[PDB]
Amino acid sequence: VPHIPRGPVMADIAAFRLTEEEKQRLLDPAIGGIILFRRNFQNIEQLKTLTAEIKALRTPELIIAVDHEGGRVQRFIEGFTRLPAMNVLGQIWDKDGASAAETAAGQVGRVLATELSACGIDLSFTPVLDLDWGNCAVIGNRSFHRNPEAVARLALALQKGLAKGGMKSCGKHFPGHGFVEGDVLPEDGRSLDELEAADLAPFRIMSREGMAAVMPAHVVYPQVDTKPAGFSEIWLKQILRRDIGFKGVIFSDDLTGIKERARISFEAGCDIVLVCNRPDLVDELRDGFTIPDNQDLAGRWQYMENSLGHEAVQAVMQTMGFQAAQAFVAGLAS
Amino acid sequence: VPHIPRGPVMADIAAFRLTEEEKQRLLDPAIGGIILFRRNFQNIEQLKTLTAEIKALRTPELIIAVDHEGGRVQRFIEGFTRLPAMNVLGQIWDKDGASAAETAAGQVGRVLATELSACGIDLSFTPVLDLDWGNCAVIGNRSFHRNPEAVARLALALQKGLAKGGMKSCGKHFPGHGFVEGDSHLVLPEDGRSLDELEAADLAPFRIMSREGMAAVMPAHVVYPQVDTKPAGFSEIWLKQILRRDIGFKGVIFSDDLTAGGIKERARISFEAGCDIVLVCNRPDLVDELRDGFTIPDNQDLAGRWQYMENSLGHEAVQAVMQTMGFQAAQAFVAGLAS
Ligand SMILES: O=C(N[C@@H]1[C@@H](O)[C@H](O)[C@@H](CO)O[C@H]1O)C(F)(F)F
Ligand SMILES: O=C(N[C@@H]1[C@@H](O)[C@H](O)[C@@H](CO)O[C@H]1O)C(F)(F)F
């Protein structure tokens, strides 16, 4: 079993089981992780087999992630608790108050993460920290709430729940996707002060409380930089690293030539580039790829490794407390 | 004032007032209409001035459109009634019944269209006819409902409201965007279902709206491999064989946003697939490239298809109607659904 450092590329796979070609691709030193999608899911036992064979290829084991946010963003349905959209939690906040909403968010996080942890998944790319300005359809009900305080608090409560389930968090989409219209490269014309007073606050607060990663917005904020955030040294190095003090992973979000697109991502401050639905572009990228110097990469990947062992998860899922959490969360979704 | 037929390209503009270069671009015979966005809106009076100067360039007057669906898709906010998301109408359906929901949809349509008609707008790109399968975040609350019957009936009721406000309808996104997952922004999703599955559900609102006089359709940027390997907006099977021949739709088929392989070639394959009018947004450079030496494809139905979309209310008539108590009550009712 070859020992190769996790590379800075997160790739993906076609279907339910690895092909031989995929195995060879995943052994490339450029690759450090995998993101899964609904097309990779048949049932829980198949998923376990898939994650095991991915993990068996090399050490440190490839980090495996998925988009389980809730509502209309939940890749794996059958055999999982159906998760509510995050704005459901914000509706509880408005109706029953912060305390009930936080409690509910904790349980959603716990169920979400634990069920995925049982299947060999390391991380869900959640939570969305974008504010619901009522402008952006592609975010839509994926946002907790309009109000930064509600978003921050619900996100923190979800994060604690995720940690109980073995998982770190990934805040999306830095520095805030909520204000633009999105239904192209959108433009958010606001000033940095306007963003600091609202959209950025949940990111600051989550970073302070141990958030593992961030996904950047594919959005230009011209008053701060002419470049989209995911390609901006100002956003990623000057604001996120230096000003906010964030030490976790900065993902590039989807780059899908590719070599040049990746280069500018890394140069801007991204640790890991995502290349989804395009194994051809992954093949093009990795051929003659030089791994950029990043002494923090290894630790940044490792912080995201799932913190629960397989047996410990099986035990927790047998408890009455967890099963009650499952039924509570199921009830929010219907 | 030059008399030029409306061309098959729908373009756009940069900001609040036309520049001289934009005026010259909009006189090109390749162009037949304009789509507006939030960046073109400062306030109602500026908007009126903008639409007037667009219309003054040529005859037949360039058709002007905008995306006013409701909820998180409403370009012009200040000075307009805030519109509810379409799923709010589906919630009324579930709670208070079809009759109350249809009535509400009629008022939303009326307010939506009338306020835009006051400003010189011809058409809103609405309604969404996609079904809420609980899969597609980008559609999300933009869909009326999960159930094809509810979607069809709410859409028809909205359509009658729109017509009261001077406007035709544009169904989105043919043949149905509801089932794919969509929470990236720039991927090409795949809907693996069979044609029969779509006919039993997602296609039915499109059939019904077509029969009842829907003026246009926007295609889904989605591949349905069991029917064709091409995305719907570039598929002869979807657009000619299914939409034209089988469904009998006679209105406008708009293209995807074509924004390389080159714009000329991308437009060519759109027209060849069955699109009447190509959209080229946020890229006046590509519109300039496209129109230079452009040969207008032969389409004897184009002129009538554009004209069917012209606003049916005169500007003064709309200002009068908006002073009425009945319309102001509609405004307050719709405002209340949004809050
Ligand atoms: O929102 C979506 N598509 C939008 C349309 O709704 C809109 O009328 C048109 C014009 O601006 O451009 C597309 O990008 C989709 F649901 F297809 F992703
Ligand atoms: O949804 C958006 N971006 C998504 C991320 O949320 C997601 O975690 C990632 C991995 O699948 O892929 C992006 O496209 C955006 F809002 F940025 F458009």
XYZ file of C-alpha atoms and ligand atoms in Angstrom:
709
model
C 0.000 0.000 0.000
C 1.938 3.061 -1.268
C 2.673 5.937 1.103
C 2.143 9.200 -0.806
C 1.321 12.630 0.621
C -2.195 13.863 -0.137
C -1.906 16.082 -3.200
C -3.658 19.393 -3.678
C -6.355 18.188 -6.123
C -9.754 16.918 -5.138
C -11.250 14.843 -7.922
C -14.275 12.593 -8.322
C -15.506 9.327 -9.809
C -18.036 8.161 -12.361
C -20.305 5.586 -10.736
C -20.837 3.044 -7.917
C -17.456 1.224 -7.893
C -13.966 2.239 -8.928
C -12.822 1.295 -12.421
C -9.224 0.308 -13.006
C -8.616 3.611 -14.807
C -9.995 5.488 -11.755
C -7.714 3.509 -9.418
C -4.705 4.602 -11.479
C -5.900 8.220 -11.548
C -6.444 8.240 -7.765
C -2.849 7.022 -7.192
C -1.466 10.131 -8.823
C 0.435 12.238 -6.283
C -1.462 15.352 -7.451
C -4.610 13.955 -5.877
C -5.435 14.233 -2.164
C -9.192 13.691 -2.004
C -12.500 12.827 -3.616
C -15.927 14.416 -3.703
C -18.938 12.116 -4.159
C -22.272 12.847 -5.864
C -25.661 11.136 -6.196
C -24.413 9.156 -9.207
C -21.998 7.419 -6.833
C -24.765 6.163 -4.554
C -26.849 3.006 -4.841
C -27.259 2.107 -1.168
C -25.404 2.219 2.138
C -23.569 -1.103 1.699
C -22.370 -0.241 -1.808
C -21.276 3.177 -0.480
C -19.268 1.541 2.327
C -17.581 -0.716 -0.233
C -16.777 2.296 -2.434
C -15.297 4.388 0.360
C -13.259 1.418 1.608
C -11.694 0.779 -1.826
C -10.909 4.473 -2.215
C -9.245 4.514 1.196
C -7.320 1.272 0.492
C -5.414 2.771 -2.486
C -2.923 4.775 -0.482
C -1.877 6.311 2.815
C -2.583 8.849 4.186
C -6.027 7.800 3.026
C -7.734 10.027 0.461
C -10.148 12.449 2.142
C -13.733 11.831 1.011
C -16.353 14.598 0.960
C -19.955 15.127 -0.119
C -22.497 17.945 -0.292
C -24.990 17.132 2.468
C -26.490 20.479 3.303
C -30.144 19.502 3.574
C -33.358 19.897 1.581
C -32.684 20.036 -2.123
C -28.915 19.542 -1.525
C -28.579 16.004 -0.198
C -26.823 13.547 -2.488
C -27.616 10.301 -0.655
C -31.294 9.715 0.056
C -32.219 6.015 0.508
C -31.268 4.687 3.948
C -30.425 8.186 5.254
C -32.555 10.444 7.366
C -34.053 13.065 5.033
C -32.543 16.400 6.050
C -34.426 19.668 6.125
C -33.295 22.716 4.163
C -31.229 25.066 6.314
C -33.821 27.827 6.017
C -36.181 25.554 8.032
C -33.879 26.171 10.968
C -34.143 29.910 10.400
C -37.932 29.575 10.365
C -37.785 27.886 13.753
C -35.628 30.818 14.931
C -38.336 33.270 13.826
C -41.251 31.259 15.221
C -39.986 29.504 18.373
C -36.864 31.574 19.136
C -33.101 31.166 19.096
C -32.829 28.557 21.774
C -35.179 26.080 20.055
C -33.559 26.783 16.668
C -30.012 26.186 17.966
C -31.075 22.949 19.606
C -32.642 21.845 16.360
C -29.525 22.806 14.336
C -27.329 20.746 16.685
C -29.449 17.697 16.115
C -29.512 18.183 12.338
C -25.692 18.429 12.351
C -25.337 15.388 14.513
C -27.613 13.202 12.398
C -26.193 14.516 9.107
C -22.585 13.817 10.088
C -23.053 10.566 11.984
C -24.907 8.777 9.204
C -22.242 9.816 6.695
C -19.445 8.844 9.127
C -20.880 5.334 9.305
C -20.291 5.064 5.524
C -16.641 6.113 5.512
C -17.200 9.761 4.553
C -14.856 12.310 6.144
C -16.666 15.611 5.645
C -19.821 17.286 4.380
C -19.356 20.621 2.599
C -21.654 22.481 4.969
C -22.754 24.929 6.294
C -23.800 27.601 3.918
C -23.112 30.931 5.690
C -24.475 33.094 2.878
C -27.172 35.501 4.056
C -30.652 35.336 2.612
C -30.883 38.785 1.078
C -33.750 37.457 -1.133
C -31.606 37.955 -4.240
C -29.829 34.724 -5.130
C -31.815 31.718 -6.390
C -28.849 29.347 -6.583
C -28.420 29.796 -2.828
C -32.119 30.098 -2.158
C -33.302 28.024 0.809
C -29.805 26.776 1.378
C -29.213 29.864 3.533
C -30.270 29.728 7.191
C -31.626 33.249 7.393
C -31.368 36.892 6.309
C -29.837 38.025 9.591
C -26.088 37.547 10.190
C -26.560 36.882 13.882
C -29.065 34.122 13.171
C -26.799 32.637 10.491
C -23.755 32.703 12.758
C -25.519 31.165 15.695
C -27.335 28.504 13.712
C -24.085 27.637 11.912
C -22.186 27.304 15.221
C -24.891 25.090 16.576
C -24.814 22.955 13.426
C -21.022 22.797 13.660
C -21.158 21.382 17.214
C -23.575 18.766 15.949
C -21.275 17.882 13.028
C -18.341 17.446 15.442
C -20.395 15.072 17.551
C -20.855 13.072 14.344
C -17.102 13.044 13.699
C -16.912 15.868 11.202
C -15.432 19.273 10.782
C -17.250 22.068 8.937
C -16.775 23.886 5.649
C -18.268 27.415 5.392
C -19.654 28.497 2.001
C -19.285 30.710 -0.013
C -16.618 33.148 1.226
C -16.969 36.139 1.554
C -20.743 35.859 0.960
C -22.823 34.766 -2.019
C -26.154 35.964 -0.664
C -26.451 39.461 -2.165
C -25.816 38.828 -5.856
C -28.452 37.549 -8.230
C -27.795 34.031 -9.462
C -30.323 32.153 -11.611
C -22.299 33.869 -15.421
C -19.892 35.665 -13.077
C -22.050 37.829 -10.753
C -20.928 41.204 -9.353
C -21.532 42.327 -5.773
C -21.074 46.107 -5.806
C -20.903 46.629 -2.054
C -18.067 48.070 0.011
C -15.881 46.068 2.379
C -17.478 47.864 5.355
C -20.935 46.748 4.185
C -19.694 43.140 3.999
C -18.006 43.405 7.409
C -21.254 44.632 8.956
C -23.144 41.565 7.668
C -22.034 38.843 5.210
C -18.502 38.401 6.618
C -19.469 38.139 10.264
C -20.553 34.474 10.183
C -17.258 33.587 8.492
C -15.246 35.437 11.190
C -17.177 33.808 13.995
C -16.997 30.293 12.516
C -13.260 30.680 11.854
C -12.687 31.680 15.468
C -14.645 28.600 16.586
C -12.614 26.031 14.536
C -14.174 25.821 11.068
C -11.933 23.478 8.975
C -12.472 24.864 5.534
C -14.014 27.416 3.272
C -15.407 27.311 -0.261
C -15.072 30.682 -2.049
C -17.806 32.438 -3.964
C -17.448 32.683 -7.749
C -18.320 36.341 -7.448
C -16.489 39.620 -8.102
C -16.625 42.349 -5.451
C -15.176 45.295 -7.472
C -14.792 47.693 -4.525
C -12.328 45.194 -2.995
C -10.808 43.453 -6.005
C -11.401 43.095 -9.732
C -10.841 39.337 -9.420
C -13.398 36.764 -8.233
C -12.818 35.792 -4.600
C -11.489 32.333 -5.385
C -8.755 33.924 -7.523
C -8.031 36.953 -5.275
C -4.969 37.334 -3.060
C -6.735 40.239 -1.387
C -9.735 38.099 -0.369
C -7.840 34.935 0.476
C -4.467 36.077 1.842
C -5.006 39.639 3.021
C -8.600 39.322 4.320
C -9.188 35.628 5.124
C -5.679 34.573 6.308
C -4.207 37.786 7.758
C -7.215 39.832 8.919
C -9.584 37.021 9.976
C -6.802 34.590 11.062
C -8.235 31.507 9.334
C -5.805 28.504 9.346
C -7.912 25.848 7.622
C -8.337 24.751 4.037
C -9.273 27.130 1.325
C -10.862 25.139 -1.523
C -10.879 26.595 -5.010
C -14.417 25.605 -5.864
C -14.975 24.197 -9.393
C -12.276 25.005 -12.009
C -14.139 23.098 -14.701
C -6.490 25.586 -19.826
C -7.012 23.726 -16.566
C -3.295 23.955 -15.665
C -3.420 27.723 -15.838
C -6.751 27.891 -13.966
C -5.270 25.760 -11.163
C -2.030 27.793 -11.104
C -3.816 31.069 -10.523
C -5.963 29.390 -7.826
C -2.948 28.234 -5.869
C -1.184 31.570 -6.363
C -4.278 33.362 -5.005
C -4.134 31.335 -1.765
C -6.188 28.133 -2.344
C -4.802 24.988 -0.737
C -6.803 22.455 -2.741
C -8.424 22.704 -6.170
C -11.698 20.969 -7.066
C -12.151 19.467 -10.474
C -15.560 17.786 -10.790
C -17.351 15.874 -13.564
C -14.291 16.079 -15.789
C -11.816 13.215 -15.309
C -10.318 14.320 -18.674
C -9.360 17.668 -17.131
C -7.997 15.939 -14.049
C -5.854 13.775 -16.372
C -4.702 16.857 -18.256
C -3.928 18.700 -15.010
C -1.985 15.890 -13.317
C 0.250 15.053 -16.316
C 3.570 16.772 -15.596
C 1.965 18.549 -12.651
C 4.308 20.208 -10.176
C 2.920 20.147 -6.635
C 3.134 23.733 -5.352
C 5.088 24.258 -2.161
C 2.675 24.267 0.779
C 4.121 23.182 4.128
C 0.638 23.483 5.721
C -1.175 21.221 3.243
C -0.620 17.942 5.043
C -1.979 19.287 8.359
C -4.885 21.051 6.667
C -6.014 17.787 5.028
C -5.456 15.801 8.243
C -7.573 18.194 10.374
C -10.506 17.151 8.113
C -10.099 13.407 8.679
C -13.160 11.919 10.338
C -12.626 11.759 14.123
C -14.873 8.762 14.828
C -13.826 5.144 14.318
C -16.228 2.781 12.538
C -17.111 0.841 15.697
C -17.715 3.977 17.754
C -20.227 5.177 15.108
C -22.109 1.869 15.080
C -22.380 2.069 18.883
C -23.654 5.639 18.934
C -26.317 4.836 16.284
C -27.716 2.058 18.503
C -28.406 4.538 21.317
C -31.907 5.770 21.985
C -30.701 9.363 22.081
C -29.377 9.181 18.548
C -32.438 7.375 17.215
C -34.580 10.102 18.738
C -32.409 12.696 16.993
C -33.027 10.813 13.727
C -36.797 10.922 14.172
C -36.729 14.612 15.204
C -34.701 15.583 12.103
C -36.901 13.395 9.869
C -39.905 15.310 11.226
C -38.408 18.695 10.303
C -37.992 17.443 6.719
C -41.737 16.460 6.546
C -37.038 56.371 -37.723
C -35.778 53.344 -39.721
C -38.175 50.466 -40.464
C -36.269 47.198 -39.981
C -37.692 43.776 -39.185
C -36.886 42.481 -35.688
C -33.809 40.253 -35.989
C -33.277 36.928 -34.247
C -30.866 38.133 -31.569
C -31.848 39.367 -28.130
C -29.071 41.413 -26.651
C -28.683 43.577 -23.578
C -27.158 46.770 -22.334
C -24.586 47.828 -19.791
C -26.194 50.370 -17.500
C -28.954 52.961 -16.944
C -28.941 54.852 -20.292
C -27.938 53.897 -23.820
C -24.442 54.801 -24.966
C -23.848 55.859 -28.554
C -22.123 52.534 -29.297
C -25.182 50.701 -27.870
C -27.515 52.752 -30.115
C -25.512 51.688 -33.159
C -25.464 48.081 -32.009
C -29.245 48.061 -31.435
C -29.847 49.333 -34.997
C -28.220 46.233 -36.435
C -30.771 44.135 -38.342
C -29.557 41.007 -36.452
C -31.112 42.380 -33.272
C -34.834 42.096 -32.447
C -34.999 42.587 -28.694
C -33.383 43.400 -25.380
C -33.339 41.757 -21.964
C -32.903 43.989 -18.923
C -31.262 43.171 -15.585
C -30.946 44.830 -12.190
C -27.843 46.765 -13.385
C -30.144 48.587 -15.833
C -32.405 49.832 -13.053
C -32.017 52.961 -10.939
C -35.651 53.927 -10.510
C -38.950 53.936 -12.378
C -38.426 57.267 -14.165
C -34.954 56.336 -15.363
C -36.357 52.961 -16.518
C -39.120 54.689 -18.528
C -36.544 56.918 -20.174
C -34.411 53.883 -21.012
C -37.233 51.854 -22.536
C -38.447 54.884 -24.507
C -35.038 55.488 -26.073
C -34.705 51.777 -26.906
C -38.122 51.792 -28.565
C -37.414 55.059 -30.445
C -34.490 53.564 -32.371
C -36.549 51.583 -34.865
C -39.853 50.067 -35.913
C -41.214 47.512 -35.239
C -40.028 48.535 -31.792
C -37.463 46.274 -30.141
C -39.135 43.840 -27.730
C -37.995 44.384 -24.148
C -38.031 41.604 -21.533
C -37.034 41.012 -17.924
C -36.969 38.148 -15.389
C -39.769 38.984 -12.941
C -40.813 35.668 -11.454
C -41.143 36.597 -7.828
C -39.206 35.967 -4.646
C -35.471 35.776 -5.332
C -35.956 36.444 -9.035
C -37.154 40.043 -9.358
C -34.738 42.457 -11.056
C -36.471 45.722 -10.221
C -37.225 46.245 -6.529
C -37.506 49.948 -5.594
C -40.878 51.414 -6.554
C -42.327 47.984 -7.429
C -44.547 45.725 -5.359
C -42.369 42.960 -3.881
C -43.517 39.690 -5.456
C -43.807 36.397 -3.609
C -41.970 33.282 -4.682
C -44.208 31.064 -6.802
C -44.147 28.265 -4.231
C -46.138 30.568 -1.935
C -49.020 30.066 -4.396
C -48.578 26.298 -4.163
C -48.713 26.575 -0.380
C -52.025 28.431 -0.625
C -53.194 25.570 -2.891
C -52.327 22.990 -0.219
C -53.788 24.997 2.684
C -56.785 26.955 1.342
C -57.489 24.964 -1.841
C -57.219 25.388 -5.607
C -59.801 28.102 -5.908
C -58.121 30.508 -3.476
C -54.687 29.713 -4.945
C -55.816 30.388 -8.535
C -57.340 33.689 -7.446
C -54.121 34.671 -5.739
C -52.052 33.645 -8.788
C -54.260 35.849 -10.988
C -53.579 38.873 -8.808
C -49.833 38.216 -8.634
C -49.769 38.001 -12.443
C -51.783 41.188 -12.789
C -49.615 43.241 -10.446
C -46.381 41.787 -11.824
C -47.233 42.570 -15.433
C -49.010 45.914 -14.932
C -46.166 47.555 -13.021
C -43.718 46.456 -15.683
C -46.038 47.534 -18.492
C -46.060 51.048 -16.981
C -42.350 51.224 -17.564
C -42.374 50.187 -21.236
C -41.521 46.492 -20.685
C -43.144 44.005 -23.064
C -42.763 40.694 -21.264
C -41.614 38.951 -18.096
C -39.879 35.593 -18.478
C -42.397 33.773 -16.291
C -43.817 31.344 -15.256
C -41.548 28.577 -14.132
C -43.331 25.309 -14.947
C -40.632 23.071 -13.488
C -41.963 20.619 -10.896
C -40.699 20.656 -7.335
C -39.219 17.157 -7.147
C -37.151 18.295 -4.123
C -33.906 17.875 -6.099
C -32.994 21.213 -7.703
C -31.886 24.068 -5.468
C -31.473 26.595 -8.251
C -35.192 26.206 -9.049
C -36.110 25.758 -5.408
C -39.012 27.899 -4.348
C -39.331 29.233 -7.938
C -41.512 26.185 -8.706
C -45.202 26.416 -7.863
C -45.534 22.867 -6.582
C -44.485 19.205 -6.864
C -47.685 18.163 -8.583
C -48.088 18.700 -12.352
C -51.800 19.450 -12.014
C -51.201 22.161 -9.444
C -48.355 23.614 -11.528
C -50.479 23.669 -14.667
C -53.489 25.243 -13.021
C -51.534 27.872 -11.066
C -49.556 28.729 -14.198
C -52.768 29.164 -16.246
C -54.181 31.430 -13.573
C -51.003 33.475 -13.451
C -51.090 33.694 -17.241
C -54.601 35.250 -17.163
C -53.353 37.823 -14.670
C -50.343 38.630 -16.839
C -52.662 39.218 -19.803
C -54.712 41.665 -17.754
C -51.442 43.522 -17.234
C -50.735 43.578 -20.955
C -48.359 40.595 -21.161
C -47.970 37.138 -22.615
C -46.194 34.281 -20.801
C -42.890 32.408 -21.198
C -42.729 28.904 -19.730
C -39.446 27.737 -18.185
C -37.465 25.506 -18.503
C -38.569 23.152 -21.256
C -38.918 20.160 -20.998
C -38.521 20.364 -17.181
C -35.656 21.377 -14.913
C -37.208 20.110 -11.681
C -35.689 16.617 -11.387
C -31.978 17.268 -11.827
C -29.770 18.472 -9.024
C -28.572 22.001 -9.488
C -26.560 23.736 -6.781
C -23.385 24.398 -8.607
C -23.950 27.232 -11.085
C -21.911 26.346 -14.207
C -22.399 22.511 -14.732
C -24.513 20.640 -17.312
C -26.888 18.398 -15.306
C -28.217 15.077 -16.534
C -31.818 13.885 -16.171
C -31.760 10.130 -16.696
C -35.507 9.595 -17.045
C -37.430 8.223 -20.004
C -39.683 10.277 -22.267
C -42.742 8.469 -20.861
C -41.763 9.548 -17.351
C -41.531 13.158 -18.514
C -44.855 12.901 -20.398
C -46.581 11.660 -17.288
C -45.428 14.716 -15.284
C -42.872 17.424 -16.172
C -44.093 17.923 -19.763
C -47.788 18.236 -18.956
C -47.739 21.877 -17.803
C -45.861 22.791 -20.979
C -48.486 21.009 -23.153
C -51.358 22.671 -21.365
C -49.805 26.184 -21.379
C -48.982 25.803 -25.076
C -52.586 24.897 -25.855
C -53.727 27.962 -23.891
C -51.597 30.478 -25.765
C -48.204 30.627 -24.023
C -46.041 32.940 -26.128
C -42.599 31.503 -25.523
C -40.415 28.921 -23.899
C -36.905 28.997 -22.377
C -35.190 25.633 -22.668
C -33.459 23.814 -19.805
C -29.662 23.599 -19.968
C -30.022 19.927 -19.181
C -29.255 16.700 -21.049
C -31.889 13.980 -21.080
C -29.790 11.031 -22.468
C -32.690 8.646 -23.047
C -34.125 11.173 -25.528
C -31.040 12.922 -26.888
C -27.356 13.335 -26.054
C -27.670 17.065 -26.618
C -28.982 19.587 -24.089
C -32.586 20.546 -24.851
C -31.735 24.024 -26.176
C -29.521 22.446 -28.834
C -31.670 19.406 -29.627
C -33.771 19.028 -32.813
C -35.505 16.124 -31.123
C -36.654 18.242 -28.164
C -37.426 21.409 -30.075
C -38.679 20.278 -33.505
C -39.864 16.734 -33.037
C -41.308 17.053 -29.506
C -42.138 20.731 -28.913
C -43.175 21.796 -32.454
C -44.560 18.609 -33.991
C -45.860 16.572 -31.069
C -46.991 19.373 -28.734
C -47.966 21.816 -31.539
C -46.315 24.870 -29.981
C -46.250 27.879 -32.338
C -44.581 30.487 -30.129
C -41.017 31.616 -29.618
C -38.313 29.185 -28.634
C -35.487 31.141 -27.006
C -31.947 29.730 -26.945
C -29.714 29.026 -23.958
C -27.477 32.028 -22.993
C -24.884 31.374 -25.677
C -21.968 33.087 -23.913
C -15.145 28.752 -27.273
C -15.936 27.239 -30.701
C -17.126 30.805 -31.412
C -20.359 32.705 -31.001
C -21.302 32.481 -34.703
C -21.061 28.724 -34.551
C -22.910 28.505 -31.245
C -25.759 30.630 -32.666
C -25.786 28.562 -35.857
C -26.337 25.298 -33.986
C -29.066 26.970 -31.858
C -31.004 28.093 -34.920
C -30.437 24.732 -36.591
C -31.829 22.988 -33.483
C -35.093 25.000 -33.704
C -34.561 28.176 -31.668
C -36.178 31.313 -33.102
C -34.211 33.834 -31.087
C -30.771 33.626 -29.496
C -29.894 35.316 -26.212
C -26.450 36.855 -25.802
C -26.132 38.459 -22.387
C -23.359 40.366 -20.596
C -21.129 40.230 -23.692
C -21.594 43.108 -26.145
C -18.249 42.063 -27.673
C -19.799 38.707 -28.649
C -22.912 40.451 -29.974
C -20.616 42.618 -32.138
C -18.728 39.569 -33.333
C -21.985 37.723 -34.084
C -23.702 40.535 -35.998
C -20.725 41.412 -38.256
C -21.477 39.705 -41.579
C -24.404 37.896 -39.949
C -26.848 36.192 -42.276
C -30.376 36.227 -40.833
C -31.623 32.640 -41.073
C -34.806 32.258 -43.032
C -37.730 32.162 -40.616
C -41.077 33.280 -42.020
C -42.660 32.856 -38.561
C -40.212 35.086 -36.718
C -42.030 38.404 -37.261
C -45.347 37.075 -35.967
C -43.677 35.268 -33.051
C -42.011 38.521 -31.891
C -45.190 40.534 -32.446
C -47.368 38.197 -30.404
C -45.151 39.195 -27.438
C -45.663 42.964 -27.831
C -47.300 44.561 -24.815
C -51.012 44.963 -25.413
C -51.574 48.031 -23.114
C -50.722 51.633 -24.011
C -48.569 53.622 -21.559
C -51.310 56.112 -20.573
C -53.892 53.367 -20.119
C -51.574 51.632 -17.649
C -50.965 54.848 -15.606
C -54.732 55.259 -15.367
C -55.352 51.642 -14.263
C -52.710 51.951 -11.530
C -54.552 54.914 -9.972
C -57.678 52.725 -9.525
C -58.613 51.373 -6.153
C -58.988 47.838 -7.513
C -55.437 47.720 -8.718
C -54.046 49.322 -5.551
C -55.860 46.634 -3.550
C -54.235 43.957 -5.731
C -50.886 45.598 -4.986
C -51.435 45.429 -1.233
C -52.668 41.815 -1.419
C -49.580 40.709 -3.408
C -47.280 42.732 -1.131
C -48.794 40.838 1.799
C -48.028 37.455 0.264
C -44.367 38.547 -0.028
C -44.308 39.445 3.740
O -32.565 29.954 -13.522
C -32.330 29.281 -14.521
N -32.158 29.882 -15.814
C -32.233 31.321 -16.136
C -33.595 31.643 -16.595
O -34.511 31.347 -15.549
C -33.694 33.057 -17.115
O -35.003 33.385 -17.586
C -32.682 33.347 -18.234
C -32.534 34.796 -18.524
O -31.788 35.590 -17.632
O -31.374 32.860 -17.967
C -31.221 31.554 -17.205
O -29.983 31.520 -16.687
C -32.198 27.742 -14.441
F -33.167 27.271 -13.584
F -32.380 27.188 -15.617
F -30.970 27.370 -14.031
O -23.426 26.196 -4.936
C -22.410 26.783 -5.267
N -21.146 26.121 -5.333
C -20.972 24.672 -5.047
C -20.571 24.353 -3.661
O -21.588 24.745 -2.761
C -20.259 22.896 -3.532
O -19.923 22.533 -2.202
C -19.161 22.484 -4.510
C -18.953 21.025 -4.553
O -19.955 20.291 -5.193
O -19.449 22.871 -5.847
C -19.948 24.288 -6.041
O -20.405 24.531 -7.297
C -22.432 28.269 -5.604
F -23.288 28.847 -4.816
F -21.195 28.759 -5.407
F -22.799 28.442 -6.933
